[PDB]
């Protein structure tokens, strides 16, 4: 089966897409807007755990306002649509990591770049932890540099887009 | 809607153990931090101790390991016991409940319900009743003074209630004796001195003595 | 412990005024988890305000909390009779234990009122037990702060009396005092002229009022 | 910059005319987005007027203004238009821009708008007001001004120039059936200060260039 | 802070996963024997591992406990997930169970016996289940062991259990595709 | 054509009240297309409510919004100074293209107040022109709802005087009113005697202010 | 659910990325090393039985390497992990083929292009069977020579990427 729940939140904001983690969705930060360009690779890839994330953390806020609470808290909806929400086989490759002493991500924490006088930003890819500990900075540093790469890519298909 | 009732032994002699209960009522025992806190006129608002369902339990490192806070989960009542009492433990305690407001207590409020409170006193004094010796006297003045009892509390009214006007009733005092002392007064009219009666109504329900004196106008 | 000192010990200010309660913190407050109660006399406290600022519920638009880190405030603008109470500030945000400043009384300021003064002299019952007490009553006096000297024989006397004062009365806002001297049988038959003289504000000189004993 | 549309245009027309209101994007794609053209006239609801779809393949009028009204937008210029033609008086009203968007993906909503374009049409010549006392006739008194037959509207009256504020009523202004506005303003005062200060309103009436002071006496 | 390339500065976020609780089960760690799955704001289900039994018959009576139907319908699903995803169950009286009342109580008893213990089996689903802070619970192609003698699943009330991992809604999230995996014909 | 019928038209409320604000349609509508907006005179609609129960950015989550089929509701848990406002919703997709209610007003509730009248004559200098404008004014009332009758010689008027409101004080909450009779010079000094007749549940007893032509 | 192992093997290599079979992977044949540029299509293609086997193959060496062998083979790990290795739709597929007459992949033979001066490799493509019989070279010709034209496609992007 394969994902499918869209990600919807265009409201006020100066060109649909992208998506707003509110303060109630992070650990003690304040709200964190990221742009279309980075959420909109959530409906391609097969392997964004933040993505997957996304898509919890949107199905949890729509199915509380559209629906109305029960008295007795059921799990039956979640049961129903955790494999539109997420891919059950990410976190099993994950789950397999970890059974091997390799690196893993337990959903938790993510890093991003952020562009420090136009503010873009990049799709938050996980920290990921190894019994207990979580990998240095160091640890994959080179990936932080490609992601740089990207995001001066995607910056320099920006401007010539722009004319 | 949650509402905490304490209740144990007022009544300490030094060098033993204080002994109380908090019973939990219109609401679950449950998601809550049960509190005990005490208020001494002097050094005011002390905590005492925490003890939470979730198994976690603090206390007040003032209080150096002789106080205990259990929860028995079944008759919905946490209780408080401080060991080797002194006279410093006298207070007036309280119930509290600490609303916990996520898992990892991640957000945090503070104690919002707190029970009426009982008063505690610690000391070797037995229970004594008071004697009422009254006071002897425009707008002339009068009253009744209850001197050596034990112990607090005692009640005093003018005229079986119909009295309310004009009577002041002085919060108690300590002597060295450990014995307690009151007055309680009232003014009235300079005219109505010989005509109406007046009768001060004392009543010390700890050693059930009710004296009541009249008015000694000489 | 993080020490909480409040300032003032004691305001005193009349309805439809502005109260500003202060309270600092030894070391900083955690997220700002610092909370004020309201205790009226006899009363347990009461919930007012909860992290630094929110209020709770049912406090009206009145009551403001105010402050961060080591500084923090509570201000009731246009007071109101029901407010008048002793504030305490309270911090829930550090390790055990958590701690509660020491106060701040709001008593109503009202127009100065000069006690009424009357003197007791001991019931005859009282001599038959071998102890004597003479009570001095301080009727209707605003503001608080009055001294009792007790003086037998034009004696001044120390360590034989005690005080206690009422709370300020709901309709005029004015305490009262009782001072009780307690001597032996053997002591009030020595002396004769027993006295109690009261210095009060609204009192242009102290005023003295006595009894003989057998008068 | 911040995201928000630059309303432009409106203003006085007679019966019949026309007039071509304007609104430009800053700081939002533009074309991503459908428009939409919504109208209040006075002392009615809001009241929708036409909408042009993101790519201008599409527009909608209500029917009130149909065939009178044309919306058309110019994504390179990033800006919206609405070319009013054959005007009636019940045209009159404030006008408002605002953005929306019409997928699958999203409600319908219009979130982003322009502030009020004014659009009065009438046959009325621009006219000062003429500024007649209301005088009072023990506790306090009322006087005040009446500030009849002018037009356009707005006018901004003060009393004693500027310095006497408390207890002053000026009342929205009644369109009368000649299509001149009228209105009244009013202020309470002691009666004991009736002889010892003067009283003065002061109807400024910018459109035609007027400024009236009118002394309010007792009898 | 890290600057890469020069403008591009290294910027972290952790979501606060409670946001779920109306949604989802949560799971948690409190300390090494003691782990949590909680389901909303009012119940939860404690997941035990201790050397002190609290069921000393070998019965679980679900036919029983499912006509009398006054057990949480949620707690219910969470225990059959977690029992239906036991790779290999057949030791059928090394799990007792007690529903009097509507409460749950379960009971698999870790010492019936490397790969082939119950025990294996029920400790992988320990594992993936409470899946943020297990590593702290034990320390081989998957297999694992434990000096401790049962796993008690007992259901609890809602508190701040959560005190050495943050709750998380993976580690049951993860395990619904192992329901009815690996399960014996009977 | 599709019909919102919002209820109540006027919803009086004090601070720190829920209020519940309701849209009926005229058909069966598609709850994602329902929107709710707040609109305060000095200013442009604000997007409060999309979707039926999405909150737009800025909106202080005391606003709500729930419904389906053709009842929806908009909710404020407890009204605050500046929420009191006029208040519309929007469907889109009908005909007309986007339809509005006619609106719901929030007003703040206050202790009933009588009107003070004051009744003004005509100015002469008015009179030397040829129209005459006599003036009645109701001033700090609550609620809104006022009667101004005109009477002349002590006849009924009907036609010949309109009416103007005040917006809710911002401090007393009150209202003021004025009703401006406008006769012809020479129909004003046909009759002798100018009353307007003020009806207010404020009022003990209907208030009649008059004055006689000199 | 969506495959989501990823294939580690960059190690002594000129760039990082591919995929080399070692002898004891292939039958009667030296180690083949396919690189970055075909072995990179594995991480999105959806359809590619290779892609699937060289995900099978690189758990099975990871799992023997970082697990330690129990004492009887338990097949336990392997139902645990299979789809995040394998898309069970594609073989689904390849069975639904079977059953209809039409040629179809049984996992075991594959073709591939070969410059014969770059070296530069094709990803491999299933050579398709029914009841028993290898399909002729013939019989998918057209399709080995768009896959030439991709590679020569391939080799132009990469000369103008070298600048
Ligand atoms: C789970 O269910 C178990 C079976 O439940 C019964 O059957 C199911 C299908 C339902 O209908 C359920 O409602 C039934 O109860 C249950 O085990 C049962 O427990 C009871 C005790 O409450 C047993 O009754 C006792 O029976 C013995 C004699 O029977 C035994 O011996 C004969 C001969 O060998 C066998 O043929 C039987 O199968 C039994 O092995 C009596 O001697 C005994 O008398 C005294 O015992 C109790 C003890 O406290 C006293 O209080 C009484 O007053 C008696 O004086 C009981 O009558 C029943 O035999 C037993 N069944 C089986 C098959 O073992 C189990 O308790 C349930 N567990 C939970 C947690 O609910
Ligand atoms: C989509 O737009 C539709 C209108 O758009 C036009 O038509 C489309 C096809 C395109 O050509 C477009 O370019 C046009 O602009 C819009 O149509 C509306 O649909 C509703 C039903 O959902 C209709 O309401 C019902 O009407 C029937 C018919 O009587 C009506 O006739 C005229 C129109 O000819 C109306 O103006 C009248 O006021 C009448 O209401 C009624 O029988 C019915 O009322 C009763 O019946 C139902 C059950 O049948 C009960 O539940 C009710 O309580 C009543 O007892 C409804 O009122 C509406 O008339 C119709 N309008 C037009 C102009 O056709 C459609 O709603 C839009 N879809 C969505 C999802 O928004
Ligand atoms: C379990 O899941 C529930 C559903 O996701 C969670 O419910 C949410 O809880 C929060 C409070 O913890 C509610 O917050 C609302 O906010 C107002 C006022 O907040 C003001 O401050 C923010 C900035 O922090 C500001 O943006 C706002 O505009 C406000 O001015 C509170 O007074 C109310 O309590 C109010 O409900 C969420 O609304 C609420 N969501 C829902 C759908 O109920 C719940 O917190 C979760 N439990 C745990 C332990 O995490
Ligand atoms: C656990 O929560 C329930 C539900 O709370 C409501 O739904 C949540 C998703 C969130 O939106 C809350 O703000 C809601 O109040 C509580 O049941 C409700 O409690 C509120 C008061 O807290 C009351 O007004 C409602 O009538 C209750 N019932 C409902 C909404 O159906 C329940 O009390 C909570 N339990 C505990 C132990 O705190
Ligand atoms: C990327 O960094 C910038 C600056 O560090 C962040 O912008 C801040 O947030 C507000 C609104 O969110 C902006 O208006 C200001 O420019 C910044 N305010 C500050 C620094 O107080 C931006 O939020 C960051 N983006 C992410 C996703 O973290
Ligand atoms: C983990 O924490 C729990 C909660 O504090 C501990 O549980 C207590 O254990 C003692 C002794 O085993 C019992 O007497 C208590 O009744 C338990 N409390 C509760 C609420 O169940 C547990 O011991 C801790 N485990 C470890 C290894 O420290
Ligand atoms: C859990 O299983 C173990 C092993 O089957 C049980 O231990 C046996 O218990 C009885 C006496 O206590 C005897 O059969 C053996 O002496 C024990 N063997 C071992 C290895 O301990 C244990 O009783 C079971 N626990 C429960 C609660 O049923
Ligand atoms: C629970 O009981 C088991 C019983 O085996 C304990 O494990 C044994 O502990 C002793 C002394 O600590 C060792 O000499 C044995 O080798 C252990 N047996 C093993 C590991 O199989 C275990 O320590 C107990 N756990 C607790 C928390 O009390
Ligand atoms: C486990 O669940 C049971 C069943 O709900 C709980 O016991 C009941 O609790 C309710 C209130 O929560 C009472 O009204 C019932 O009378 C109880 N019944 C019985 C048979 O006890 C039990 O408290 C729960 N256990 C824990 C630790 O939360
Ligand atoms: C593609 O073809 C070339 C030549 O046919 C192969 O290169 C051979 O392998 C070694 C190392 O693997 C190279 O160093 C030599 O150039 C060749 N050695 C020979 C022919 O003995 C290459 O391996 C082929 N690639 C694949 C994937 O089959
Ligand atoms: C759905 O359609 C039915 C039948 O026309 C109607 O009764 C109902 O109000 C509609 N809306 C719903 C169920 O939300």
Request: proline share 5%.
């Amino acid at each position: 089966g394969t994902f499918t729940w869209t990600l919807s939140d265009s409201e006020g904001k100066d060109t649909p897409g992208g998506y707003c983690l509110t303060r109630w969705m992070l650990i003690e930060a304040e709200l964190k807007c990221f742009g279309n360009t980075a959420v909109a690779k959530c409906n391609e890839k097969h392997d964004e755990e933040f993505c997957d994330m996304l898509r919890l953390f949107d199905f949890n806020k729509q199915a509380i306002q559209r629906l109305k609470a029960p008295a007795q808290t059921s799990i039956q909806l979640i049961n129903k649509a955790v494999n539109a929400l997420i891919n059950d086989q990410l976190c099993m490759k994950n789950h397999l990591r970890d059974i091997m002493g390799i690196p893993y991500c337990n959903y938790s924490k993510y890093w991003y770049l952020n562009h420090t006088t136009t503010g873009r930003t990049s799709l938050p890819k996980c920290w990921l932890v190894s019994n207990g500990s979580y990998l240095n900075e160091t640890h994959f540093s080179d990936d932080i540099e490609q992601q740089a790469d990207n995001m001066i890519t995607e910056m320099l298909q920006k401007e010539y887009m722009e004319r | 809607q949650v509402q905490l009732q304490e209740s144990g032994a007022g009544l300490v002699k030094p060098s033993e153990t204080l002994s109380l209960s908090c019973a939990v009522s219109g609401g679950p025992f449950s998601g809550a931090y049960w509190t005990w806190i005490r208020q001494t006129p002097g050094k005011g608002l002390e905590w005492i101790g925490e003890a939470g369902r979730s198994g976690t339990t603090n206390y007040n490192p003032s209080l150096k390991s002789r106080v205990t806070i259990s929860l028995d989960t079944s008759k919905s009542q946490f209780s408080l016991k401080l060991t080797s009492v002194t006279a410093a433990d006298t207070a007036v305690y309280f119930c509290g409940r600490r609303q916990i407001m996520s898992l990892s207590n991640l957000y945090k409020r503070p104690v919002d319900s707190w029970g009426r409170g009982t008063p505690v006193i610690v000391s070797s004094a037995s229970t004594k009743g008071p004697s009422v010796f009254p006071l002897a006297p425009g707008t002339a003045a009068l009253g009744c003074l209850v001197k050596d009892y034990f112990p607090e509390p005692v009640t005093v009214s003018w005229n079986s209630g119909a009295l309310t006007s004009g009577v002041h009733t002085f919060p108690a005092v300590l002597q060295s004796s450990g014995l307690y002392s009151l007055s309680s007064v009232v003014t009235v009219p300079s005219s109505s001195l010989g005509t109406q009666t007046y009768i001060c109504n004392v009543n010390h329900k700890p050693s059930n003595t009710k004296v009541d004196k009249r008015v000694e106008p000489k | 412990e993080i020490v909480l000192t409040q300032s003032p010990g004691t305001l005193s200010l009349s309805p439809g005024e502005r109260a500003t309660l202060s309270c600092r913190a030894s070391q900083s407050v955690t997220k700002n988890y610092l909370a004020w109660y309201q205790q009226k006399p006899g009363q347990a406290p009461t919930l007012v305000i909860y992290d630094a600022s929110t209020r709770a519920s049912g406090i009206p638009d009145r009551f403001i909390g105010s402050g961060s880190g080591t500084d923090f405030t509570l201000t009731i603008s246009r007071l109101e009779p029901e407010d008048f109470a002793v504030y305490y500030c309270h911090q829930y945000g550090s390790s055990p234990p958590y701690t509660f400043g020491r106060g701040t009384k709001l008593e109503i300021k009202r127009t100065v009122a000069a006690p009424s003064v009357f003197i007791f002299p001991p019931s005859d019952e009282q001599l038959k037990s071998g102890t004597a007490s003479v009570v001095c009553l301080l009727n209707n006096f605003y503001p608080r702060e009055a001294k009792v000297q007790w003086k037998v024989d034009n004696a001044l006397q120390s360590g034989n009396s005690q005080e206690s004062v009422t709370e300020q009365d709901s309709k005029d806002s004015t305490y009262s005092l009782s001072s009780t001297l307690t001597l032996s049988k053997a002591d009030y038959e020595k002396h004769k002229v027993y006295a109690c003289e009261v210095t009060h504000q609204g009192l242009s000189s102290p005023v003295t009022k006595s009894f003989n004993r057998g008068e | 910059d911040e995201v928000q549309l630059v309303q432009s245009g409106g203003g006085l027309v007679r019966p019949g005319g026309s007039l071509r209101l304007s609104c430009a994007a800053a700081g939002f794609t533009f074309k991503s987005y459908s428009m939409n053209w919504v109208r209040q006239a006075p002392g009615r609801g809001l009241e929708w007027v036409s909408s042009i779809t993101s790519g201008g393949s599409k527009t909608y009028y209500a029917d009130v203004v149909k065939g009178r009204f044309t919306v058309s937008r110019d994504n390179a210029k990033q800006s919206l238009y609405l070319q009013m033609n054959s005007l009636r008086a019940e045209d009159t009203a404030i006008y408002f821009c605002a953005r929306s968007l019409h997928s699958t993906s999203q409600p319908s909503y219009m979130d982003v708008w322009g502030r009020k374009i004014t659009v009065i049409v009438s046959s009325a010549s621009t006219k000062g007001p003429s500024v007649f006392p209301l005088a009072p006739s023990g506790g306090t008194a009322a006087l005040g001004c009446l500030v009849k037959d002018y037009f356009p509207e707005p006018v901004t009256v003060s009393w004693n120039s500027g310095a006497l504020t408390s207890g002053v009523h000026t009342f929205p202004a009644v369109l009368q059936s000649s299509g001149l506005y009228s209105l009244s303003s009013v202020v309470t005062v002691p009666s004991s200060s009736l002889g010892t200060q003067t009283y003065i309103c002061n109807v400024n009436h910018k459109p035609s260039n007027t400024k009236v002071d009118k002394r309010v006496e007792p009898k | 802070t890290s600057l890469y390339k020069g403008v591009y500065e290294l910027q972290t976020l952790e979501l606060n996963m409670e946001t779920l609780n109306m949604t989802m089960p949560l799971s948690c760690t409190k300390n090494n024997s003691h782990h949590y799955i909680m389901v909303g704001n009012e119940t939860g289900l404690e997941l035990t591992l201790t050397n002190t039994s609290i069921i000393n018959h070998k019965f679980c009576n679900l036919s029983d406990a499912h006509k009398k139907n006054l057990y949480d319908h949620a707690l219910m699903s969470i225990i059959s997930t977690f029992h239906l995803s036991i790779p290999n169950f057949n030791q059928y009286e090394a799990m007792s169970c007690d529903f009097n009342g509507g409460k749950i109580s379960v009971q698999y008893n870790l010492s019936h016996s490397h790969c082939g213990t119950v025990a294996n089996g029920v400790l992988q689903t320990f594992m993936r289940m409470a899946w943020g802070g297990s590593y702290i619970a034990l320390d081989n192609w998957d297999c694992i062991m434990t000096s401790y003698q049962y796993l008690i699943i007992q259901n609890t009330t809602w508190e701040d259990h959560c005190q050495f991992s943050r709750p998380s809604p993976i580690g049951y999230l993860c395990l619904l595709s192992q329901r009815t995996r690996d399960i014996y014909i009977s």
